[PDB]
Amino acid sequence: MKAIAVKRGEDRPVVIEKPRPEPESGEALVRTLRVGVCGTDHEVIAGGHGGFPEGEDHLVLGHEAVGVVVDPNDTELEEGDIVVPTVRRPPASGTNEYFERDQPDMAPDGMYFERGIVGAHGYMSEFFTSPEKYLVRIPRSQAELGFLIEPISITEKALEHAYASRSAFDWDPSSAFVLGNGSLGLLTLAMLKVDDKGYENLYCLGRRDRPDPTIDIIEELDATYVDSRQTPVEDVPDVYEQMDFIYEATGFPKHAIQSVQALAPNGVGALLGVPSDWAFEVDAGAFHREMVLHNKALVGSVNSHVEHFEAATVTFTKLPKWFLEDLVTGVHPLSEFEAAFDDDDTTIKTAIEFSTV
């Protein structure tokens, strides 16, 4: 079968061939329908070959997949079921408490592999296997855009943990501010619009000039576009208002620090970004005191698990049809896959189509 992989020495993804996998006990064989591309994929392409699976000369890309079960093997899944796989699998040392307790999304570095990212081949191949316990059935009609279930799930987990931090008091937020206009930030903004918390005023940070299709999505959602070149995060309360909830999706370290200043009293910031080391002058006194005197929280989150993928299916049904149309700027057949890895301002979310149902 064909697969899309990064190799040592190649700067871009390429097509390779390798045998179709055969399912082990407890696993099903899945025919890949579509696999999404996000910032994480570009980071893997830009990175080294450290994340390659032990003793292998490539890494098959892709962690946002939807497929059809073609062999349920000894599982309780059925032939023709539409499924989305979770990303984390046990490391070389085998199982551990995080996998045994069904919370591998909480495992620390070294205690998991992430398919398509670190230690294990991804899903950009014509077929893949996975344990049934890591295959989430989704509605048949979500097959077309089923590659969005994993990114939605990332936000579902982050909101779960951020909202948990506020659960000791009666928190009823009205304003929310997403930092970042990449596919995760824009998906998150639409999710916040329909969130059961009932946010009234939405904001999204970017650094684009008009005309720009991310600005257009932000504004079409009735949110306010905040250009960080004009209004830094710390100035947002003055220019706009204090934000009860902040979701950081830029990977820009200054936003982690300054979010505390933009939060309303009793607010929380969820942190999703994965920055490199970067040192500069910080008023740590102001950071520290504001957290305490106004009962604020910062919560970091990574990955997601089965309940979040299930929650994503319900949230998907509530997203506007225009928004899903505008978010997904290109679905590319495997025959012309390269354009899925385009990285310019008019590319928001892309996927590669391996097969149709």
Add this chain to the structure above:
Amino acid sequence: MKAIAVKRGEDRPVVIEKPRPEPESGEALVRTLRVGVCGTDHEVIAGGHGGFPEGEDHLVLGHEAVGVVVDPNDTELEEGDIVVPTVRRPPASGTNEYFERDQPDMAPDGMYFERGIVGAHGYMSEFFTSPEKYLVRIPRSQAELGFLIEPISITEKALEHAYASRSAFDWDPSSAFVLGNGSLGLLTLAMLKVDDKGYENLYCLGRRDRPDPTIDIIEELDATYVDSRQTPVEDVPDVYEQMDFIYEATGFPKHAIQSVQALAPNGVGALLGVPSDWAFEVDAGAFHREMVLHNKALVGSVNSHVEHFEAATVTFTKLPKWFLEDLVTGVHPLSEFEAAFDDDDTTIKTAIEFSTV
């Protein structure tokens, strides 16, 4: 009646006289038994006269009080009841959502007064009044050390909110690290020893040379003393172990930042300290990435409310008798009150006694 107050121009607390207060509807009159002194009191003494009550030339000190109800007025309290008052009262603008929803401990700056601290006279007077809703009955036998119920309550709230942040997953911590060896930190360390979470390994940060009575308390609790001059917070994982729970009670901004590096994956730091502005070089990239990749949280907390004061009574019963004996280094009669404000290394927790039961 006599009261202990700070005045404009006096560097130290002094004795004043003012009329006994009369209870308004919904309030009881309380005879003060003992009032504790903590770092907050020293900060008020060191500060300006901005926190003085509107149009008054002094501020009566003290926010950690225990007294006996002498006139229940139109309340459901009884004559002879032992009570501890909460600290926050409505500001000049009157009631607001935080008071109406019984969560004034979540009110932001300007939307509360704190008795003995900002905007309202404290409890270091022979008598005081308070709404019955802000008087917490405690066991009669806690009268002697009833001034410890408010500080215990501060920790009860902070733990409630920090633990809430971890409630979306199965968190079962084993290590805890209190930063600070002042009365709040040492009380907190003893509380963590008996916490229902079942911590196995305890640590407390200070910067004292032996012999020192805070080191002795730390070690007598079977905790490890971490001298920050030897081992900075960021080095603690290497020298000791990663800490599932960190409670910051130093008011030192570097500890807010570095706590993230000392936390175990999935851990939380509670922040209690109230630092002034202070800017210096911070690796914000490392801070940000570690929060995210290891699902960590920082939660700030201030004040406390009725449920936390009730919880404190139960926790008090579990604290070792030797620990309560060693923590309280001096109870001073009003006749010789000045020594309660001693601020040297051998002074841990003090109180002033206004009357006996």
